[PDB]
């Protein structure tokens, strides 16, 4: 038991560094950017405010040093004055609309809340919330159309007290649904908190981090939206947010070393950060990298991290943001 959780959380782990050229803080990101997608233009949308308001950020990752500026939500579907968003994944249909996926916890329950992003305007239009039975405890999602996802549960229960004994009793009962509007089914379960999920970009393989059991399964995707499983990579690291390189498929990891640090906060003792590179990943020996690794004396919690043009940008629970030159 004891032994169980030490393992679990990691509570050995200490981080030797990996330095990269020229890391910079991102100005005005100071309150988490848990979860961040980049799209092929360069426009990258980060949330934060996790739980100043939540709000979705936007970056041109295209500019000299990329400033953030605040998303404005329109619509009356939303009410924004409890926005706590998580998880977020993107979708651009045929005609080239943007559509935003963003898990949200507006109090002790889970929906995924569908947004139009209107580019000219820097701001995103609320069209539908979206809440379901098999989505009690939605961590992330990645979206396959305008209202179609897998989504990860990260607990099985809703009720946070529920949620807490699960964890800490090692249930492992996280599991993974598909949504779409005809059809909503568990597609694979029993996961020792199932978080970051993401597919590659010929639609094939969904990837699914299992944050306590420090793995990422890979599932063979099918025509009928079922998975089977594939292969599992395991890593002596909590694994968090997965980001897909559309170019070449390769997966980008934040991860959290130690897990102690991450989940019972001590300011005098903050989590630091850790970004894996994983190439060739149904190989049999897939290529894993410690791209960026360092203790929070610069960036604590990192969650999730993604590259552009030879820029990679990290976020983290909540906490602030960096991007560097890789
Ligand atoms: C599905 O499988 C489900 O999860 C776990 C193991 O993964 C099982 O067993 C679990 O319960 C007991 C409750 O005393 C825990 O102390 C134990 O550490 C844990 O492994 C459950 O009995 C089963 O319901
Ligand atoms: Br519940
Ligand atoms: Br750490
Ligand atoms: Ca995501
Ligand atoms: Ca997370």
Redesign the pocket.
């Given at each position: 038991?004891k032994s169980?959780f030490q393992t679990r959380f990691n509570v050995h782990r200490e981080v030797t560094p990996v330095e990269l050229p020229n890391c910079n803080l991102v100005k005005g990101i100071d309150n988490g950017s848990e979860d961040l997608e980049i799209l092929p233009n360069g426009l990258a949308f980060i949330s934060s405010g996790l739980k100043k308001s939540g709000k979705i950020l936007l970056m041109d990752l295209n500019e000299k040093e990329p400033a953030v500026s605040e998303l404005e939500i329109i619509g009356n579907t939303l009410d924004i004055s409890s926005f706590n968003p998580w998880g977020i994944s993107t979708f651009i249909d045929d005609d080239n609309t943007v559509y935003l996926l963003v898990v949200n916890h507006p109090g002790s329950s889970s929906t995924v809340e569908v947004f139009k992003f209107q580019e000219e305007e820097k701001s995103l239009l609320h069209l539908k919330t979206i809440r379901h039975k098999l989505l009690p405890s939605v961590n992330d999602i990645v979206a396959v159309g305008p209202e179609h996802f897998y989504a990860t549960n990260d607990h099985y229960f809703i009720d946070p007290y529920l949620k807490s004994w699960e964890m800490h009793?090692?249930?492992?009962?996280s599991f993974v649904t598909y949504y779409s509007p005809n059809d909503v089914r568990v597609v694979a379960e029993?996961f020792?908190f199932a978080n970051g999920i993401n597919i590659s970009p010929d639609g094939k393989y969904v990837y699914i981090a299992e944050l306590l059991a420090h793995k990422i399964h890979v599932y063979e995707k099918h025509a009928n939206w079922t998975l089977t499983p594939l292969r599992v990579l395991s890593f002596d690291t909590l694994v968090d947010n997965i980001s897909v390189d559309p170019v070449t498929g390769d997966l980008w990891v934040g991860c959290h070393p130690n897990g102690m640090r991450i989940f019972f906060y001590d300011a005098e003792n903050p989590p630091g950060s850790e970004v894996l590179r994983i190439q060739d990943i149904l190989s049999e020996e897939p290529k894993v990298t410690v791209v960026y690794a360092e203790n929070g004396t610069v960036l604590q919690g990192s969650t999730v991290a993604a590259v552009y043009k030879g820029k990679l940008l990290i976020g983290t629970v909540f906490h602030k943001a960096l991007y560097c030159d890789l």
């Open positions: 038991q169980s009793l090692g249930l492992a009962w029993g020792d």
